[PDB]
Design a protein around this ligand. Structure first.
Ligand code: HEM
Ligand code: LSN
Ligand code: LSN
Ligand code: FRU
Ligand code: K
Length: 463
């Protein structure tokens, strides 16, 4: 048997029960009726939902290889998304992921470290924030540039100047695509149609934007082929090309110029928006909780001071800051259902039998907002990651990057970006709201499978 669920209607399954508006809350409501493991029907396609820590851990961690598949919907083929890391499966995924992890280690791309790349972006970020000259400002665009340029640095070896038109084009395309991809028409409703694409225009626009990106990446690969130093790979492209020229006696290979372009599009896609949104949300929460900000600044001033950049090494001496970043991620819950999984083979889970390829939906909300691990889980409070002594308290329930075999490839990178960008900002600025802090609402705007902060402005007042 599959896990029990609400009985589907004919030809529409469970669609009309589920509140598309806030899918996570519906899943949670269902869990109160059917328990931690239950089945929903998306017009005949069964979806098993895992809710709560135990179920999620059992599946993602203890039965990891079996739950390592990526769930497929029509959108995957309509936006040509299954050829990188994020939406790939089997051998293509294993190989590209493995390689990408090796390449993305702090020193996996020559002498220049990933941390160096992030540190340079943090100085640039601070500078743009000075240029606002302490006036009101929607930080959206500035905070989005920093992570985008980090990926640029990782892939092409060199960051762009924030005004370089080639950068502004990449960024604009990416924004467009992500905003389109956020629409419930594109994420949900159009997947109800298994064969006919009811938004052919939209997908065309998506693909055109991709092609622009892929074509820019091709220009660079060429440049990288004409300046290849086999002993000194400096970026993700070099590393990929060396992997190719190491596989030439083994075709057909998962490593080709085409998988390089698709993998890089994945890294831009995965690596920008979520980090950007997390940073923006962090500043909103810091505005609203100025005591919190002050405690971070106390750590900064005491451990780091003013005569130098904040580096990772600092993080182990700054538990309060570490707790603040962790708590931002836990509270805001940007991917409440992760990305969909799928079982790779027939598998007995608990006392249910789940057939190979069945889509699994993991509720990360249920873990991050566990009300016993994180009492008052609905409140932002850095103490959720602090012991009674004021030290950092780890949580097995801290899964904003998901868990198991499909855990975010950028976990460590996003971790550096968040810590270095936040510390560098509060090293150099205080934060002043336009409106009254008591009047700001930090509660998240959900629209489908995606959380987002509300709109706000602030002033970056130099110290
Ligand atoms: C705070 C920022 C980020 C968050 C919260 C985040 C979170 C996630 C989550 C939840 C997943 C899905 C895991 C799953 O399928 O179960 C994921 C996948 C991924 N993330 Fe991130 N991510 C972030 C930043 C980044 C960055 C900076 C990169 C850049 C390398 C990146 C690369 C990826 C990739 C490649 C995947 C696909 C992994 C796979 O399916 O095998 N992410 N991320
Ligand atoms: C039809 C093939 C042309 C594809 C295309 N490439 C780009 Cl670039 C544009 C800019 O709008 N477009 C057109 C486009 C037209 C309508 C939409 C759209 C916007 C809101 C709601 C539904 C649609 C839609 N897409 N397809 N049909 N209707 C999106 C892109
Ligand atoms: C100009 C190119 C912009 C990026 C982009 N446009 C499209 Cl279309 C693709 C499809 O993969 N992509 C790549 C992409 C890959 C993964 C994601 C992603 C990664 C982690 C978590 C959620 C997402 C997601 N899926 N849909 N929207 N955002 C977003 C975009
Ligand atoms: O597999 C059964 C098929 O039925 C559909 O739900 C149609 O709603 C598709 O999403 C799925 O592919
Ligand atoms: K049209």
């Amino acid at each position: 048997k599959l896990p029990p669920g609400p009985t589907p209607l004919p030809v529409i399954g469970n669609i009309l029960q589920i509140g598309i508006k806030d899918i996570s809350k519906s899943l949670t409501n269902l869990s109160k009726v059917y328990g931690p493991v239950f089945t929903l029907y998306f017009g005949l396609k069964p979806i098993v939902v895992l809710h709560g820590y135990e179920a999620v851990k059992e599946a993602l961690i203890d039965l990891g290889e079996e739950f390592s598949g990526r769930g497929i919907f029509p959108l995957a083929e309509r936006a040509n998304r299954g050829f990188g890391i994020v939406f790939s499966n089997g051998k293509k995924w294993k190989e590209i992921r493995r390689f990408s992890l090796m390449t993305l280690r702090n020193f996996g791309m020559g002498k220049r470290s990933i941390e160096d790349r992030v540190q340079e972006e943090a100085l640039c970020l601070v500078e743009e924030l000075r240029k606002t000259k302490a006036s009101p400002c929607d930080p959206t665009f500035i905070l989005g540039c920093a992570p985008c340029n980090v990926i640029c640095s990782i892939i092409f070896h060199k960051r762009f100047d924030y005004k370089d038109q080639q950068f502004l084009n990449l960024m604009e395309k990416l924004n467009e695509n992500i905003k389109i991809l956020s629409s419930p028409w594109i994420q949900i409703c159009n997947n109800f149609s298994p064969i006919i694409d009811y938004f052919p225009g939209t997908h065309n626009k998506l693909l055109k934007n991709v092609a622009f990106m892929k074509s820019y990446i091709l220009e660079k690969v060429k440049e990288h082929q004409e300046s290849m130093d086999m002993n000194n790979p400096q970026d993700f492209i070099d590393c990929f090309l060396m992997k190719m020229e190491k596989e030439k006696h083994n075709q057909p290979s998962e490593f080709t110029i085409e998988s390089l372009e698709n993998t890089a599009v994945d890294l831009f896609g995965a690596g920008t928006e979520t980090t950007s949104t997390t940073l923006r949300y962090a500043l909103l929460l810091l505005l609203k909780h100025p005591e919190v900000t002050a405690k971070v600044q106390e750590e900064i001033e005491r451990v780091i001071g003013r005569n130098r950049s904040p580096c990772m090494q600092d993080r182990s001496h700054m538990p309060y800051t570490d707790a603040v970043v962790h708590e931002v991620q836990r509270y805001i819950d940007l991917l409440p259902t992760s990305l969909p999984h799928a079982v790779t083979c027939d598998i007995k889970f608990r006392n249910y039998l789940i057939p190979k390829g069945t889509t699994i939906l993991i509720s990360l909300t249920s873990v991050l907002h566990d009300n016993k691990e994180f009492p008052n889980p609905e409140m932002f409070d850095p103490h959720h990651f602090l012991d009674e002594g004021g030290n950092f308290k780890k949580s097995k329930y801290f899964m904003p990057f998901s868990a198991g075999k499909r855990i975010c490839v950028g976990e460590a990178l996003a971790g550096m970006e968040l810590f270095l960008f936040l510390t560098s900002i509060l090293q150099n600025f205080n934060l002043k709201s336009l409106v009254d802090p008591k009047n700001l609402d930090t509660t998240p705007v959900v629209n489908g499978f995606a959380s987002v902060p509300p709109f706000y402005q602030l002033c970056f007042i130099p110290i």
